Amino acid sequence: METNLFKLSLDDVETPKGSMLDLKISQSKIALPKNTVGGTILRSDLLANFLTEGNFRASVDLQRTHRIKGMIKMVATVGIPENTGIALACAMNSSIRGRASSDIYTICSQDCELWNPACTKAMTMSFNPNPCSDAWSLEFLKRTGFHCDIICVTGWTATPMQDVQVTIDWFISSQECVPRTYCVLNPQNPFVLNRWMGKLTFPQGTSRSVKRMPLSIGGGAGAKSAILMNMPNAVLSMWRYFVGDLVFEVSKMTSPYIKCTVSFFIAFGNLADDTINFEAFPHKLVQFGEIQEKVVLKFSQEEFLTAWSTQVRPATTLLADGCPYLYAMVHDSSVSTIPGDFVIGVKLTIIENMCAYGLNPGISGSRLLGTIPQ
Amino acid sequence: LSIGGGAGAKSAILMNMPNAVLSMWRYFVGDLVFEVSKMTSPYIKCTVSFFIAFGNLADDTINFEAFPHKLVQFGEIQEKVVLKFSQEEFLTAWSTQVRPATTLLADGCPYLYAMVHDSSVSTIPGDFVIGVKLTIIENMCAYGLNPGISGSRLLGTIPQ
Amino acid sequence: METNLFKLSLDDVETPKGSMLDLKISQSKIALPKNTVGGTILRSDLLANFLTEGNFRASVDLQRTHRIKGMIKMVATVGIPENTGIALACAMNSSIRGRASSDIYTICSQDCELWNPACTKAMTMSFNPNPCSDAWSLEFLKRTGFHCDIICVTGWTATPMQDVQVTIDWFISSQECVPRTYCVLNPQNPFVLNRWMGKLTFPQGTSRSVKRMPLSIGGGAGAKSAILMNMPNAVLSMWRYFVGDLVFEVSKMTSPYIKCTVSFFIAFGNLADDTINFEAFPHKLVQFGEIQEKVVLKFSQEEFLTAWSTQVRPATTLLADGCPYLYAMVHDSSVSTIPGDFVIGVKLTIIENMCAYGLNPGISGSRLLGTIPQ
Amino acid sequence: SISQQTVWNQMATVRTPLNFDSSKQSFCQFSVDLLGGGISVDKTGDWITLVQNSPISNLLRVAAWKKGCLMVKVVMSGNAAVKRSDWASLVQVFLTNSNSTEHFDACRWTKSEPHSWELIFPIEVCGPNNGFEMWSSEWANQTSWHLSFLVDNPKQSTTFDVLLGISQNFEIAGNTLMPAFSVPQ
Amino acid sequence: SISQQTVWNQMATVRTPLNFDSSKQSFCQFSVDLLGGGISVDKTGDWITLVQNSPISNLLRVAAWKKGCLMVKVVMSGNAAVKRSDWASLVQVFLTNSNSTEHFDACRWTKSEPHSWELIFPIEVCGPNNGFEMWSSEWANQTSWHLSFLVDNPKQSTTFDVLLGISQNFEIAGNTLMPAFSVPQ
RNA sequence: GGUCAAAAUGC
RNA sequence: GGUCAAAAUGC
């Protein structure tokens, strides 16, 4: 008539499996006050504090399970009409050491995604918090500093009628965690860099409103009296000279109602803004579909002859750069029927088929990178 | 989810045959197929969350979305979302009628909850309005015969 | 770049599956104060109140899941040495209508089990709360009255040094729910009756301490000025005459240190207590192994010639019963080295291969059934 | 099956107030909860009610889940010193599932037979579990079966006896855990 | 199918004028349109009529096409203070499809039972669509079913209750678009 | 009949 | 490269 406790199944060390419902760990509601200006920290905390925000089916499983060999899945949601737009981002970095920066340079290297709710009414990011292995723990997330920053990069185009709320659904995924380590002296391929290369703003009118971006990319971001930094750059700067194929990601952050055809090419800084003749250069013309927000741009390694310098002193006059630049131009005009400024953000996602000849002793600080209102 | 007598009116009951008959029975189950229609301008945005519960729960129940639920979103020019709740979302057949006063604390009959999972947002004054119509009960089971219960409760309506 | 919510797996209507750990709904701790006397209600509440007692892995699953097509599994646990003993029981009935009785007659028809912790250090009962179908709900358990009574039937033999606590682990099982309905006029086989047929107490010494139990079993239990009742009896009493094989379950409720060899047989009430000659009757001698607490006893239908009456008036003199009785005797002695009284409880589990000739108009009330201290 | 003929069993025996002031009206009112086992009465007088601890009466009070057909019988034994040319009494019978005014009547009989009358009718219990019903449970805002009465000149149409019988197809399951039934004398 | 025993549902409850001058004659007259849902009355008095917003009552008022069998029940609850040797009342019942004098009667009952009587009978709806009929529609100079009454000494044979029940084979189709039904209290 | 117990452990 | 999206619906 007796029961053996020993042969009871109370000692199962396994990763939660189930339906997207069953594997729901939390529900965070984030607030998007209609007077939001851009560069605004909507909520910066600890992941573990983000996940511990509701009692949902695998919630205790998150807390009373020591090894989770699956992935944190976010599902965000806020709908905004087509005559306005906000540019939000979820940045997950691996630790915070103090009163840290919440730019976008500084918070987009590990795993972060930008989205204009007017175009993308529901985003889903998945990440692996221990970039070094295949499992995580809540206590890990807790006692290590895993951070989640939710920021506005380019504020409202049109100010909505009342406040808004972004609801992020958090879950554990059905897919395994895969590492992403960096050997600093023997890079991989494709090398993951993820660099905010700039927030390009084109005013309304018939101005070629030509934006030039340095292709020298070590030290990182400039600050008044300081340098801003993210690992994927830290390491790059460990090298001296570089080449490869540069893959850029152009995102629209303004309201699908602000129109422009933007022309991208590759040149040098010695050219005047009135150079009729550039479009006689390899160039690619970009145009955004109403609800289209991401154009991926690929420049091949054949657009560069010789490797270039990883760093160039900050004063080096647009007449002395011997390093290739990434020029963006208005091929037509900026046109709208509502006040607004066309804003598109550029992020260097991966350098593919890289070649790094050298080792950089260093050069003090770096130059500035675009930003501004809304 | 009690649906016999029909519609409430100030001092009266409103009626349509497909309900007349339902109410002829006493208890019912089946799969309830609902049809959610947008009636506001494609510029008024909202993500609506639908599920099935009971009336004892407070409006501040963080935890519902840990219930089978389905999230609805409308495409600009999209106006009809068909929603299907399976018979497996209900354990036992429920009553076809419940007195009109029966306090949201005494309904033992399943309800059809709709929620805002985000927000209502627009750049023009407006109120998000979606109409719900129970198109067909599929794979029905009707145990009973209803002697009747006087009148019924009210159903939403309003301007624009 | 967009996610469809519609094709997301947030609408899963399925019964929780998992490891005994994953499918843990609650943890109730029950208190066994060392001054416990027997017939004591240790805790009488609602199942739903028993299950809602801790946040354990499938706990929210219990609450936010509408159809559970699996079984409530209890695992109880309290260790008591071999020189004492308590007789606890977990009775799960389907509703309570008022200030109800908590005997053992009244609370053991549906699904209940008696256990002496000195012998059985861990019990496991499994039940199906909707005896009418294959699924349950918490709201069901809630708004229908499912009851759980935890009672002491025969108090401590030896009073422990300090208080004790029984911890009951509650879980959802891996096994399906199977109905058990009763047609009252066309019984099944084997008919489930589960009837407290008595609490037989044999004092220490050389007394044949002969206990006779009426085999007429309709109306149920007697009370001072009333009748006590449980469905499996309600229905039996619907009939008039009955036969079949009677399967009895003899349980020890005293400390494995109180010894006795009990002799069971079948006779009539006209015999004197000094009837040398009974053991010349079919009889079966019972003896309990130290840690042994349950002896199942089967009397075959061939021990009865003709069907007997389901009811007999309460006054009917042990000289006028024409209905078979279930005699229990001491074939040796009650012996111990500690004060105690040998106590064994008898429960008629199933009548097998039944024959019911008739329909009972009824006879007012019924007779008494044994009980007492410890 | 298991069967026997003409063996019904007692449930109700309702007697009418003796103290009745033919002034605060003509009628007396009462109800019997067939599937619950309760007699509900007036404030008209001092009523003499009894429910019988019958095999069935007993059974329906204890059995939590009920599916099937039960047979009812109400008998009016009346005041027989009253001369048949001098009868002024009817008794309006009703069959409802609630004791609510807002609920509607299932069947409705009205009998005005001097000194004695009989009324045999079927009741069937249909419910939401698998076709099983539970006494006035909140689950599917569940109900019962009620047999209410209205007596006019209750001094005449004095006594009421309620008997029921069971159907070969009555099926129960579960135990409604109930207090001790009181047994007279 | 879908069935339950002894569950009928209410439709009519007609009460007789209190103000009745046993001088401008002996009788009171009234009618019930079973398939239409209307009580038509005298000018004899101030009549107290009610139709019950029943599952069926409700149904027959809304359902434009009707084929099948419905079951009727009329009950006479009367004045019970009247001594049974002193009864002077009959009540002549008729079943017609029009309220016209030129139409002829289908069935004809006459009941004179003191204080209370019962009358259970079938009605069947047969029509020109496919065997479907519509309330008094001009289409095939269509008709209904009417239950008219004639009460003699209406002060005695006071109240009338009309119940109907449905047949396993009642089939409707279409919606007769009707105003809001009035619900008391 | 259900339940339960049981058909056993170690690297 | 990861992520994501996608390879579509109804009984």
Swiss-Prot record, chain B:
Locations listed in the record: Virion
Residues under site feature: Cleavage: P159, Q160
Source taxon at top rank: Viruses
Coiled coil regions, renumbered to chain: none
Domain free text: Contains a beta-sheet structure called beta-barrel jelly roll.
Subunit-level organization: Interacts with the small capsid protein. Homomultimer; assembles as pentons. Interacts with the movement protein (via C-terminus).
Function per UniProt: Together with the mature small capsid protein, forms an icosahedral capsid (T=3) enclosing the viral positive strand RNA genome, with a diameter of approximately 300 Angstroms. The capsid is formed from 60 copies each of the large and the mature small capsid protein. The large capsid protein interacts with the viral RNA.
Protein name in the entry: Large capsid protein
Species, as recorded: Bean-pod mottle virus (strain Kentucky G7)
